[PDB]
Design a binder for this molecule. Sequence first.
Ligand code: MG
Ligand code: MG
Ligand code: MG
Ligand code: MG
Lengths: 177, 183, 177, 177
Amino acid sequence: WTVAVYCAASPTHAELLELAAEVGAAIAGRGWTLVWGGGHVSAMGAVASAARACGGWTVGVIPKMLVYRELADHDADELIVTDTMWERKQIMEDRSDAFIVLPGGVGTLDELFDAWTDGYLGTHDKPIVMVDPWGHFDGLRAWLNGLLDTGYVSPTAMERLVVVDNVKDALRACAPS
Amino acid sequence: IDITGDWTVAVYCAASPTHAELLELAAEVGAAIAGRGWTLVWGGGHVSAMGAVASAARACGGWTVGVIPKMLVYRELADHDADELIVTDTMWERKQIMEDRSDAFIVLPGGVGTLDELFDAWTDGYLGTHDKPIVMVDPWGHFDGLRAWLNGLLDTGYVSPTAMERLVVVDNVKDALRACAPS
Amino acid sequence: WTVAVYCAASPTHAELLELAAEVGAAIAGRGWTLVWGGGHVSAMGAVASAARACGGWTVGVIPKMLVYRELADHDADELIVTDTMWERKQIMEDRSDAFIVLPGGVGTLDELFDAWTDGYLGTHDKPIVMVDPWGHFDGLRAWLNGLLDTGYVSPTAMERLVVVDNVKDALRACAPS
Amino acid sequence: WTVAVYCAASPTHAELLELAAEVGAAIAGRGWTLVWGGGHVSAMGAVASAARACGGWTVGVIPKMLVYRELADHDADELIVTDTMWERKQIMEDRSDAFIVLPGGVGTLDELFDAWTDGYLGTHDKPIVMVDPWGHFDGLRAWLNGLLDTGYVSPTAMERLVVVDNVKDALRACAPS
Ligand SMILES: [Mg+2]
Ligand SMILES: [Mg+2]
Ligand SMILES: [Mg+2]
Ligand SMILES: [Mg+2]
């Protein structure tokens, strides 16, 4: 059983690093495989470092452009280097049984909306779980609720994304049948 | 010379209809079990698929063990030509003797009794009580409505992928006995 | 008067946990004993927890192999641990005056078909009452109606099972008659 | 790597079955072989059934006299049937790299003191680990501390027996170091 974790690439906020490490540790704890974007910086470094420390298998999928920038975790158990971002996202989706979205920026939002669009349209039934203990995404979810009200997003679309505020509820939402 | 008498297969199958496609299938299974030198276990009836599987096994020189509850003996269903006929007081004793005697299970088209035997085996195999093969044989799509419905339970998390993998479904007898055979 | 409730061991769908809780609360409200498979997860945990919450007595019957997996509800008023699945099913039947079947998977279908065969073969005249508010079992009953038409299932067998879409009609059908 | 588990043959306490299953699952998890007394009853049945359920290999070693009494686990991966109790203990010792002692009675105490004396006198350096979450052995250990106080037991003897209150620390103490 494999969970992809989409999360921040830049900041070092203690609460962010702790949350990401808590998820990596809990995935490894269940004996699940971690898929992530293969970076050593910020939340990406935290989730894979914590999974490996708890004996978890880690699969990093990263485009060569970020390898050339020395942003890759060469301690990944498997490092899949892709020529393009579209191949990175395709391999992460294909390898994973479920998706966790932690606080992040444009790169995290790209991964979130890529998975959500495919899940909503019915390409796959894999859980997509947003984990937001402190309201990082409150402004985004409020704005999307506006789109629900003006007919741009359907209730069915809004249902497809599970939002939890703690790691325990996250792993229960991602767990196998 | 090839071993005989080293393996036993239970066959769960219809007690009522006489459709030709059903009796042909059940006779083909009984003949193939006896042809491998395996013992047949079945629900002990002489009617429908139950009568065909046991008649064909005996006609190919195989041993037949029927296990029938008193309630179905009262309905004049008992195959008195069984090599061993075991009459039980209860359904639970019937299913338990069939399971203990058998190394593998074949499920053919049937109704409520067959489905009882199916789900009873499948639950025990999924919970890990035994690793005996459970093989459904469906050449014509008897069970298509059930399998579509079970796929919807898989999609909504009522049945797991692991559970679905524990049940083998084939459309022919040769593949069925390959799935039942000892390693 | 004792009702056994056969229901889902795995999923946490709100419609399912709500149904199970409603059934447990109603059984307790009649002063009836709840018999169940003795687990604290999914519909099984909700039916028994809700019965005890409303002052009802709960008898859990669970095989050792599930106790090993930490699935036993240690707040059962009586917990019966059996060596086998055949003994679990036989004790739940022997203790019970009626059977309720809620949405479930393979374990629930095993309980349903086991009771239905016992019922159809004249072992007992205990009510067997399927409670299906949202059509969980529609695909199964539609397929069975095809078997009735082609002579694989008898009209006597099909009429042995009561099917209702609500808890009030379900307890009406379970009541001493 | 092979761990022998010495444990209760008689009582069915839920908490005992859960601990034994946790041990068997943890041993199988490491890819270690389980050696045990080959019984299907009580903690003995629990440890072997849980190891096999997690894909572990199980080796039961049982004297003919107990096989006569319908006590042998027919689902042992290897069942070694010995003529005598002394041959049973010798084969269990010879096949194993480490020994775990769970709560038990006279048979368990026999296996404990047999392994402990040989360890102490220097016949082998295999870990002997007592796993006692709830103080099953507190009375025995207090009494052995009295024997240490009066010169009947040496400090070297008392140190030879590792006592832990949880399964993670047990497997750490048993691991090839
Ligand atoms: Mg997409
Ligand atoms: Mg069974
Ligand atoms: Mg019964
Ligand atoms: Mg010794």
